[PDB]
Amino acid sequence: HMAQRAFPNPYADYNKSLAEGYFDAAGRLTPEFSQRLTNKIRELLQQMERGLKSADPRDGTGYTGWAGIAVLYLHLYDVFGDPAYLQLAHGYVKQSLNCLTKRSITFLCGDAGPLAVAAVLYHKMNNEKQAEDCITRLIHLNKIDPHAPNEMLYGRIGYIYALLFVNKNFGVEKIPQSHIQQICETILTSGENLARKRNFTAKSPLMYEWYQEYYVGAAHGLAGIYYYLMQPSLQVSQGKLHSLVKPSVDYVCQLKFPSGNYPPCIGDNRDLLVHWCHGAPGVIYMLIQAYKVFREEKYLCDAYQCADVIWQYGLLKKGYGLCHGSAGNAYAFLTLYNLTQDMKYLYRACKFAEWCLEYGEHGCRTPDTPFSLFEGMAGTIYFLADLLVPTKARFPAFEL
Ligand SMILES: CSC[C@H](NC(=O)CC[C@H](N)C(=O)O)C(=O)NCC(=O)O
Ligand SMILES: [Zn+2]
């Protein structure tokens, strides 16, 4: 039923001849293709700026609101170096800081997004007082919601991302590692406890849930949590990596549909969603990181299968967005490219970019927030700009 959710892929798969128009033998984009990306970015930015005039004033979040637009502009500033982009980011940061709701802790859906993005913007504008004030507030946020879930949009790893985002952008340990360590400990303890209570232990030493479901994917589920627990940034011990995380990863691997896709929740029989939030485009990160950490070929094999599912069924009728759209799906190819150095996957990303360059010409659904980072145009623009330098590309607000 995946076919019903996708457009047929109109593109030929990789060969040397077809790839030459997009990038050279070193994987560096051609000037021509680079400029075509740049031209579309400028075109879409105009539409986005106009569209955001109608966006909800109250939503300051990374996922659907102002801080996510600031994330885009910070990225464009880094890519292009145009000071006007940094100024745009400032405007959006200011809007976002007037929208704190005190209800959530995450980068994507909570107050950590505005605060972490603001800290970085202020730093980039040489505003030490405001940068430091934002960091203080961000650190303190780790109190307003204990017994949170563990997942990306509403839970502990979503807060961890905000901390990592500051540290990466300052290039120094602005948030002490000990802060990250203690959250990591809570996550691991939570997983062991739930697995024990539900007698998963033998097959899966860790287990997590959100909204009373065992979500499997990146946004709300196991694949996102395990991707994080396997990151050197989180400093999980070798002992816990092998005894707790690896067998829990293997359990997720075992949930794979015959197609190579993954169910949204444990026990789901319908093979339908090919999204970052649910399915192969989000689970692929766990597989790739598992390969990097454990070096077992099965993980790489599974990642290849993810890429094939996405190549076939990844041009979504849903639209061009990151959370569940063609641009988010294209990032799966970039992560596999960056692991393998196989230009086939850079090519696939470029062809998905070609699709996005025809934005609005396919009869896609209009997103609920048509201009947002995760549902809308800002995310598509983010992807196009990130593709300019493929080796540095990372799925925003998620990939490390
Ligand atoms: C965490 S996002 C989950 C996502 N939700 C949507 O696609 C809803 C539409 C969204 N609000 C938009 O406007 O893009 C989804 O997978 N929906 C289930 C489905 O497509 O059947
Ligand atoms: Zn989604």
Numbering used by the authors: 0 to 399
What's the publication's text?
The addition of the thiol side chain of Cys residues to dehydroalanine and dehydrobutyrine is a process that occurs in all domains of life and is catalyzed by LanC enzymes. In eukarya, the process is intermolecular and involves the addition of the thiol of glutathione to remove electrophilic structures from the proteome, thus preventing dysregulation of cellular processes. The addition of GSH (C-glutathionylation) removes electrophilic Dha/Dhb residues from the proteome. Previous structures of NisC, LanCL1 (23), LanCL2 (20), and the LanC-domain containing CylM all show a characteristic α,α-toroid fold with a zinc ion bound at the top of the barrel by two His residues and a Cys residue.
In this study, we first determined the co-crystal structures of LanCL1 with GSH (to 1.51 Å), and with S-methyl GSH (hereafter MeGSH, to 1.58 Å). The binding poses of both GSH and MeGSH differ from that observed in the prior low-resolution structure of LanCL1 and density for the amide bonds are consistent with their expected planar configuration. LanCL1 residues Arg4 and Lys317 form hydrogen bonds with the Gly-derived portion of GSH, His274 engages the Cys-derived amide carbonyl, and His323, Arg364, Asp367, and Glu374 make hydrogen bonds with the Glu-derived terminus of GSH. The same interactions are present in the structure of LanCL1 bound to MeGSH. Attempts to prevent the reaction in the crystal by using MeGSH during co-crystallization did not result in a ternary complex, likely because the methyl group on MeGSH prevents peptide binding.
